[PDB]
Amino acid sequence: AKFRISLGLPVGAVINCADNTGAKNLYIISVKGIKGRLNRLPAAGVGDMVMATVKKGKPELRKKVHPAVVIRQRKSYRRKDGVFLYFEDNAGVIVNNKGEMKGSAITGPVAKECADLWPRIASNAGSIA
């Protein structure tokens, strides 16, 4: 089971797209698993499923809602064994509902939290940080 992680990406955040589908942006519009509370924005961290829209990218996937998974984040979070880790940028990849990647390759590192939750994403990762 996945332990709780410091969330850094609320609704409205634009993150890089690390796959090779042609999308360059992911604009987060919602997060799975979020019941929510009054006035509280849904927020996502590494390993979380989100609905995003492509703001810059190839036209055939620009004006739609896509599933995506966050693989890197700038907000430092505490792994057990007391390690605070953050990345240089926020990133995600476009996937389907079952978790399979729409792309075939991932640029840059992938957090260990998202790799363990999503084996298909991990198999496309060059490195795990």
Binding site: A1, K2, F3, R37, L38, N39, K80, D81, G82, D116
Partner: protein, 402 residues
């Protein structure tokens, strides 16, 4: 009309009076239920909060992602020098409740315990218990004591011990001992009284009350924070920037028709210094305290069976806003109430411990001892001297000596 969108209320009315606690020492409001089949034992103890540090251990819960993996856990150190038994209290059960039947005190009571009986010890003549003690010596008084133990034997259902902490051994400005009643559980009332009588005037170490990897309750008073607004006291939503006459307040404090402010509305007032009882705190370690053996002082507190560093639980430079810890201590997982130096009440659990988390046996691999007075990076002074090398102050001392 109805609230447009539902939201749970801010705060809990289970801590409603939200005032300064009438007591500085934590109070046991319910002792563990007595079981006569169990051996005679104590149920509570008094310690002092020295500070916090973090440990490293490997966990043993099979289905977890951290199973057989090394984790870092925050802990709190509670210095617990032995307590001295000075009295016995008997209670009888009545249809109006538990009533104090008779209390008996020991012959010699130390000056630190007598200090609790005075508001100005400096001006006092120290006459407390000077006539009571003579009863332990006189033959007529001795008979009355025996009769008073016998009446307790045949009439009392609850037996407690009056015990106090030794503040000589603590690095605190205060010299006045904390007195407490600790209930005796197990056995019969006769066996409780015999147990109490024989260790009257004696010393009870903390290892005879609590054991390793057991889950205990901590009672104490919360850190004081004075007068506070509803935004900090009750965590209400801040009003917009362009609000007239104040942002940090509750906009509507009630409807028209009940025509009164209800007790359930957040108001500004005292925050902190509240009596609280947290219930599931595991004992990660029971330290041994400094002792002199063969002319050499043993500092080996907080040396695990994986580092053997020959260091003490004391961090480099000492605990901040608290002296050195030289006595027995209890290491608890997590945080506890109170400031530093705050006296804590530790009592046995009222619940039956059966979950895996409560029953698991923990074994520390490392204990952090870096300075808490900054961003400490050296565990011991010897480690720092080896890494740094000779300094100018050492060469100056060598020049002065030679």
């Amino acid at each position: 009309s109805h609230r447009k969108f539902s939201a749970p209320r801010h705060g809990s009315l289970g801590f409603l009076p939200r005032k300064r606690s009438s007591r500085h020492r934590g109070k046991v409001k319910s002792f563990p239920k007595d079981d006569a089949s169990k051996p005679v034992h104590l149920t509570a103890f008094l310690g002092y909060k020295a500070g916090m540090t973090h440990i490293v251990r490997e966990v043993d819960r099979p289905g977890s992602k951290v199973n057989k993996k090394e984790v870092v856990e925050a802990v709190t150190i509670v210095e617990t020098p032995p307590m001295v038994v000075v009295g016995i209290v008997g209670y009888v059960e009545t249809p109006r409740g538990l009533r104090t039947f008779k209390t008996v005190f020991a012959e010699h009571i130390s000056d630190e315990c007598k200090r609790r009986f005075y508001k100005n010890w400096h001006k006092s003549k120290k006459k407390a218990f000077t006539k009571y003690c003579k009863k332990w010596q006189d033959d007529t008084g001795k008979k009355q004591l025996e009769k008073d133990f016998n009446s307790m034997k045949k009439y009392c259902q609850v037996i407690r011990i009056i015990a106090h902490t030794q503040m000589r051994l603590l690095p605190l400005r205060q010299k006045k001992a904390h007195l407490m009643e600790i209930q005796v559980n197990g056995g019969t009332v006769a066996e409780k009284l015999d147990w109490a009588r024989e260790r009257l005037e004696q010393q009870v170490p903390v290892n005879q009350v609590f054991g390793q990897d057991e889950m205990i309750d901590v009672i104490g008073v919360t850190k004081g924070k004075g007068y506070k607004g509803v935004t900090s006291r009750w965590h209400t939503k801040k009003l917009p920037r362009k609000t007239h006459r104040g942002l940090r307040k509750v906009a509507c404090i009630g409807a028209w028709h009940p025509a009164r402010v209800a007790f359930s509305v957040a108001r500004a007032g005292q925050k902190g210094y509240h009596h609280r009882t947290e219930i599931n705190k595991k004992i990660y370690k029971i330290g041994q305290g400094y002792l002199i053996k063969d002319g050499k002082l043993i500092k080996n507190n907080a040396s695990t069976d994986y580092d053997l560093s020959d260091k003490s639980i004391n961090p480099l430079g000492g605990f901040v806003h608290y002296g050195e810890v030289t006595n027995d201590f209890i290491m608890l997982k997590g945080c506890v109430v109170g400031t530093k130096k705050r006296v804590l009440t530790l009592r046995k659990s009222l619940l039956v411990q059966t979950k895996r988390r409560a029953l698991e046996k923990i074994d520390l691999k490392f204990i952090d001892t870096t300075s808490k007075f900054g961003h400490g990076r050296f565990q011991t002074m010897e480690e720092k001297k080896a890494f740094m090398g000779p300094l100018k102050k050492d060469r100056i001392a060598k020049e002065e000596g030679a």
